[PDB]
Design a protein around this ligand. Structure first.
Ligand code: CL
Ligand code: CL
Ligand code: CL
Ligand code: CL
Ligand code: RB
Ligand code: RB
Ligand code: RB
Ligand code: RB
Ligand code: RB
Ligand code: RB
Ligand code: RB
Ligand code: RB
Ligand code: RB
Ligand code: RB
Ligand code: RB
Ligand code: RB
Ligand code: RB
Lengths: 396, 395, 395, 396
C-alpha cells in the first residue's frame, strides 16, 4: 500500500500561458518554455534553492529537432545544477502526468529528495520530416511528413487521426454535434470566467519577449476566440456532412509548459517548507488504441483505489478535454456530474500542448481546489495509443 | 523494498548503419527483442506483462509512443502501460531502472524494459516550412546529428567531446587504436565460440518476389576489423593532431534489447526461475562536454546503492561510446581491462544509442554465465553530461 | 539585314509587373504569358489568333512550370494546337532573344505570323532537393533556392549578381551616391509616366477571381520610392563600403510581355496596319562577371546590323538590372541620360527576368510615341556574360 | 530553302548514352554538353574552337543546372567568352530545334560558325519543394519529381506521356506483341551496330577521373540489357492488365549530349573545310497534345517539302523511338518501310536523354548514311505537348 512507502509533497507549481499554434509563444522552443515553468515554480518555494533539485522528469512528445534530451535542456535552462539527473518522458498526451508519477516514485524508492517534474511542448516548432534521404528514392514524387500529424496525432496501428477516433467515441456513447458544441461553449465560458476573475494569475508565469521595451504574454490565447455563432455553424473537421467533432469543440494545437516541485517528508521538515498538496496515489490504464478516449474510465478508478479514496469524496476533477466528447464520455461512464469537472475550463478552451497538458491540468487543479475550497482532487488524461494516466492530490 | 528479478533478456543482432537491419523500424526491432525475451520464461505468459518502459532517442517519424508500438508488436495486451524514455545514450538502462522502481512501489508485478534505435531510419528535418522562408537557401537537418550526436550547449559532435576526453586524461591515437583492436578481437572470439548465441534472437527477413529469405544472426560490425587499415586511417574530428577515428569510435547502428523483470511475489506465485537480481543503480551527471567520464560517478553511486564493493565485481560493461571513454573511466575507477567488456564492446559490436543501455546489460549476463561470475556492473555515459549504472547478481 | 524580308510589329502588350510574393504571385508563368499574348492579339484589326503559326517565349526559372512553358502560354492564350512553340533561356535577355528568333523565322520564310516575348513568375520559383535519388547517407543537406541558382548566381564565380554589380561600380568608378541619384531619377520618371497614363496603352490589367474580384492595373514597384530611406539604407552585398542596395538594384518580380510579328506579304494580304518595323539586332558576350557592360558591345552591333547611327536613335531602353548597369553603359557608349529609359526602368518598374527583354521593347514603343520619336534601341544584359539589343522604327 | 544560303555540317559528336543513375550519373548536363561540343570541334581540320560565334543548346529539365545551361556547355568546352549562347526547350525535340535555330542564324548572316545540339542529365534532375516561400502551416507536403513534372507529364491533361502512348496504341491498333517485337528488333540493331563498331566514330568516350582507378565510359549502356523472354513476360507499365506499353518497349530515362558544327558557304571556302553534310530543309508541326505521338507524320512531309525532296528519295530515316508504338504509328501513317528506319537501332534500345535526343539522332543518322552509303537522310522527333521537328540532310 501507499502508506508502506515514503510520502511525497507538492510544494509549488507553475505554468506558462498556453499559446496558439504559430501564435503568441511560437518564437520560443520547447526547452525555453520548460525552463520558464521550472524556474517560476522553484521561485515559489520559500526555503528551497534550485541547486537542491536532484532529478528532473519532463514530458515532451514531438522532440524532433529539439536537440539532445529535452528534459536536460529544460533543467539547465532553468538554472539547475549540471549534476541534475534529467530524463525526457513520452506517453503522448499523458507525458506530463507520467513524468510526475516517475518523479514521485524516485523519492519513494529513496533515490532523490527534491524532484522537478512536468512537461513541455512547442507544437509551433514541430518540423516536417524527409524520411528517405539516406538511401534515396530513385523516381517519383515524395513526401514531407508533418511531425505533428505523425508523432503526435496519428494512432500508429490504424494510421488514423485521433479526431476520427473521437468521432468513433461519439458513435460509441451517443453524443451529437449539438451535445459536443454546447459542452464546448460551457467550458469556454468557464475558462473566460476564470480569466476575468483573475483565477489563473497565481498559476500562470507571464513570459517576457525581448524586443526597445519588452512584450509580455500574460494570458492563455485560446479562450478569447469563442464565437458561439460560428461554432454551431462550422463544417465538421473529420467527416464531411455527418461529422460531430469540429475544430472548435476539439482541443487546438498549442505551445506551453508546466512544472511541479516534489519533496520527500524528510526534506519538507528539514527545510521547513510549506506543502501545497500531498500525492495520495496514481493509476495508469490502457485499452484498445482507437478507444483511448475512454481510457480515463479505467485510470481514474485505479488512481482512486491506489489512493484509498472514494469517487464521491473528490471535490474537483480535471478530465483533460482532448475533445469535448472525451469529457462527456468519461463523465457518463463514471457517473461524474459536470459541476465537479474542469471548473476553470479545460483543454478545448485553454489549449493542449500535448507533452505539457498532463502537468498543466494538475497545476490548474490545485488552483481550482484553492479557489473553490475543496481538499481532494483527481486529474485524468487520456493519450493516443489507448492509454490514460490519473493522479489524486490532497490540498494541504 | 521488494526485490526485483531479471527472469530473461534478449537482443537483436546489432546491424550496421544502412545495413543488415535497415529495413526494420525501431518498434519492429523492439518488439522482436521483447517477445524473444518473453519466450525464454516458462510459466510466464506475455499477457502477464503489465507495464513497459522502452528507451528511444531519435523518435522522429517513428510514430506515436515508440514503446507502445514495441509492446503491441511483441504481442502484449492492449492493457499494458507503455512509456518511452529518452536519456540519450543511457535510455535503455534508465528504462530498466524505472521498470524496477515500478515493481518496488507495488504498481506492477511484471515489467518489460529495454530500448531500441533505428539510426538507419532517422529522418532529416525541414524546420521552417510552417512560417516559410521567402528567399535564401535553406537547411535540412540530419536528425542523428541534431537529436543524437550533438551536445546542446556547445553544438559540437560527440567525437569532439571525446577529443576533450583524450586530452583531459592523456590517451593517444595509439592507446585508443590498441584498445579498439583488443575489443574487436574480443568480439570476434565470442562469435566464433558462440558466446552471443543465447542472447541474440536472429531476425528472419523473408523476400518473396522470387527473392531469397535472409536470416541475420551475427552482429555486423566485428567482422570489419582491419588492424592495418585501422592504424593508418586519418583522424575523424581533428585533422593531424586528432586521436579519435571512425574505427576506434562506436558506429551508428540498429538494434534493440529487452529484459523481463518480476517482483518477489510473482516469482514465487508462478514458479519462475530467475536469471539475476537487480542489486542497485545510480544516475549521475556533470559538465555536458565531460559526459565521457560521468560513469566515474554513476558506477560508484550504483555500487554504494547496492551495498557492493568495487573489488567484488566479476565483470564490468562500460559502454564504449569511444575507445577513449573506456580507457578514461578505467583509469579513474582503477579497473583492470581484464574485467571489462569481456566479449567486446560497442566500438566493435555497434551502438544503437537508445538500446545500448539494455544491450550491455544483456551481454553482461552472458559474460557472467560464461566466465562463471557472480556480481556484474554496467555503466553507460550519455550526451548532455550524464551517466547511468546498474549492479546485478547472477543466480 | 535590309536585304532580307521585312518584319513588322503589329502589336504588343504586357501584364503589370508585380512585386515578389505580391499582387501577381497567385498566377503561374504560363498564366501571365497567355494573358500578354491574348491582349497583344486583341489589338490587331484583321488578324485572328488562329493565324499565329509559331511562338518563341522566354522563361528562365522554369522549374515546376511543367512541360514547355511557351506551349502552355500559347494554348492558354487560345492559339491553335497547330502552333509551333519553343521556350528560350538566355537568362535576363530571354524575352528579347525570343523576339529575334521570331523575326528570323519570318525572314527564312518558315512563318508569316509569329508571337514572341517572355514570362517569369519569380514568386513561384521553387526550392530544390538535389540529392534524393542517390541519397546522402549522413550530414545536413541544403534546399537550393531556385531563383538564386538558376536566375541570379554566376556559374563560374558562384557569386550573386549584386556582387557583379559591385565589380561594375569598381570597374567604371560609380559611387554609392551616383547610383542612388540615378535610382531616384528613374523612380521619378516611372511615377510621372504612371500618373500621366502613359503605361495605360501597353498594360493589359489582370482580373483575379474573388471576397470580390481584384483588378491589378499598375506596376507594383514605382510607388515604393522613399528618397530619405533610399539614401540611408545599408548596402546589400558588401558591408560598410558597398555601393549596391536593394533600392538602387532591380527587384525580383512577376510579369510577362508579348509582341506580334508579321511578314511583309502577310501585312498586305490581311491589310494590317503596322506599329513598327524591326531594323536590326545584335547579341554580344564577354567575361561572365562583366555581363553588366555587355550592352556596350551589343548596342553598337545592333545599330550596325540596322544600318543606323547611334546619334539617330530617339530613345534607348537600357535594362536596369542595377542602377550602376545603366550608368556604366551610358558612360561607355556616350549616351546621355536624357535619351534613356524615358518612362523609368527596371530599378523602379521591376525585373521579371525571362520577360524583361520583351517588357522593355513594349515600353520603348510607348516612349517613341509619347516623345514623338521614330528610332529606338533596346539593350539588355544577362547573367553569364551576354547581352542582346534590337533597333526598331516606329511607323 | 533552295533560295536560302547554304548551311554545312562539318562535324558531329555525341557522348555515350548512360542509363538512369548509371555510368554517367556523376556528370552534370553542361559537363556532358561541353564534352560533345569539344569532341565535335576536334574533328574539323582547319576550324578552331575560338572561331565558334554562337551556340544553341537544348535542355529540358534545367532545374539546378544554374544560369543558361547552353552557356555553361560552351564555356566548359573551351569556347570564347564572346560566344552567344541560348538554351532551347521544345521538350523531346529541343536538340533538333536547336540545330534549326543555329542554321537560321547562319542563313540570316548573323553568324558563320555555329554549334548546336542538346544535353540532358536526367540522373541529376532534382525534386522541388513548391510552397516554402509562403509556408505551409499544417499537413503533409509533396516533393515534386522534376522529371515527371517538367519532362514526362503533358501539361494540359496532367497525363504522363506513356498514357498518351497507350492512346496511340489504341488509336492505331498496335498490340502488345507488335510493340514488343519492334522493341526486340531495334535492340538487335543497336547491339549489331555496337558490335560492328558502327558507333565508334560518332561516340566520344568519357574519362571519369578516380577520386580510386579512373573509369572510361565508351559504349551506350542500354543496348546490352535486352532479354527477350523477360521483355515479353513483363507487366504493362501504365495500364494494368490490358496495357500494351512497357518499360522494355519504351524509351528509358538517360543521360547524354550531342553536338553538330555548322558553317556558312563563305566560311567553308575561307578555311578550306571538308563538309560532312548539307542541311537541305526542316519542318516543325504540332497537333492535339495527347496526339504528340504522330506529330512526326506532319513534320516529316513538311521538312521534305521544305527541302525539295520526295519521301521516296530518302535513304535512311531516324524516327525517334519515344515509344516503340511511336515508330510503328509514324511508319504506318507515312508508308515508310521499317528497313529504312533507325538502321542502327533507336532510343528504345540506345536511350533517350530528352534535351539531347534531337541532336543525338542526327549524329546517328550521319553515321547510318556513311555506313550504308546513302545520300539523303531525314530525322523526325515528336515531343511532349503535341509537337514534332524534322530535318533533311544530304551526305557529301
Ligand atoms: Cl497507450
Ligand atoms: Cl545528462
Ligand atoms: Cl551569356
Ligand atoms: Cl508542342
Ligand atoms: Rb526559492
Ligand atoms: Rb504568478
Ligand atoms: Rb477549440
Ligand atoms: Rb513464455
Ligand atoms: Rb537465442
Ligand atoms: Rb568502430
Ligand atoms: Rb484580333
Ligand atoms: Rb484589316
Ligand atoms: Rb491597354
Ligand atoms: Rb529597387
Ligand atoms: Rb579543330
Ligand atoms: Rb570517336
Ligand atoms: Rb527500353
Amino acid at each position: 500500500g501507499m502508506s508502506s512507502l515514503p510520502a511525497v509533497y507538492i510544494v509549488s507549481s507553475a505554468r506558462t500561458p498556453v499559446g496558439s499554434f504559430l501564435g503568441s509563444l511560437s518564437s520560443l522552443t520547447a526547452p525555453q518554455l520548460g525552463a520558464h515553468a521550472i524556474k517560476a515554480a522553484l521561485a515559489k518555494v520559500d526555503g528551497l534553492k534550485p541547486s537542491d533539485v536532484q532529478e528532473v522528469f519532463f514530458g515532451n512528445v514531438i522532440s524532433a529537432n529539439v536537440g539532445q534530451n529535452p528534459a536536460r535542456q529544460c533543467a539547465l535552462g532553468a538554472g539547475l545544477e549540471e549534476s541534475t539527473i534529467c530524463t525526457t518522458v513520452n506517453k503522448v498526451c499523458a507525458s506530463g502526468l507520467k513524468a510526475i508519477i516517475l518523479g514521485a516514485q524516485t523519492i519513494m524508492t529513496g533515490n532523490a529528495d527534491v524532484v522537478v517534474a512536468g512537461g513541455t511542448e512547442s507544437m509551433s516548432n514541430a518540423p516536417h520530416y524527409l524520411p528517405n534521404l539516406r538511401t534515396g528514392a530513385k523516381y517519383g514524387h515524395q513526401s514531407l511528413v508533418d511531425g505533428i500529424m505523425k508523432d503526435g496525432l496519428t494512432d500508429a496501428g490504424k494510421q488514423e487521426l485521433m479526431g476520427l477516433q473521437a468521432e468513433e467515441c461519439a458513435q460509441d456513447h451517443g453524443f451529437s454535434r449539438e451535445q459536443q458544441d454546447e459542452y464546448a461553449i460551457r467550458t469556454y465560458e468557464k475558462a473566460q470566467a476564470a480569466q476575468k476573475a483573475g483565477l489563473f494569475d497565481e498559476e500562470i508565469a507571464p513570459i517576457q519577449l525581448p524586443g526597445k521595451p519588452d512584450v509580455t504574454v500574460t494570458q492563455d490565447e485560446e479562450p478569447k476566440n469563442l464565437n458561439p455563432e460560428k461554432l454551431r455553424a462550422i463544417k465538421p473537421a473529420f467527416i464531411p456532412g455527418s461529422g460531430t467533432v469540429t475544430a472548435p469543440n476539439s482541443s487546438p494545437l498549442n505551445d506551453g509548459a508546466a512544472a511541479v516541485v516534489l519533496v520527500s517528508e524528510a526534506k519538507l521538515k528539514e527545510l521547513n517548507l510549506k506543502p501545497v498538496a500531498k500525492i495520495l496515489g496514481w493509476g495508469d490504464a490502457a485499452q484498445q488504441p482507437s478507444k483511448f478516449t475512454t481510457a480515463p474510465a479505467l485510470a481514474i478508478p485505479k488512481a482512486l483505489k491506489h489512493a484509498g479514496v472514494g469517487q464521491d469524496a473528490i471535490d474537483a476533477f480535471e478530465i483533460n478535454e482532448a475533445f469535448s466528447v472525451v469529457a462527456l464520455a468519461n463523465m457518463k461512464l463514471l457517473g461524474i456530474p459536470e459541476e465537479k469537472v474542469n471548473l476553470h475550463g479545460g483543454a478545448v478552451a485553454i489549449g493542449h500542448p500535448i507533452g505539457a497538458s498532463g502537468a498543466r491540468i494538475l497545476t490548474t487543479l490545485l488552483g481550482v481546489l484553492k479557489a473553490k475550497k475543496g481538499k481532494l482532487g483527481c486529474a485524468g488524461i487520456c493519450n493516443g495509443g489507448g492509454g490514460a494516466s490519473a493522479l489524486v492530490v490532497e490540498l494541504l
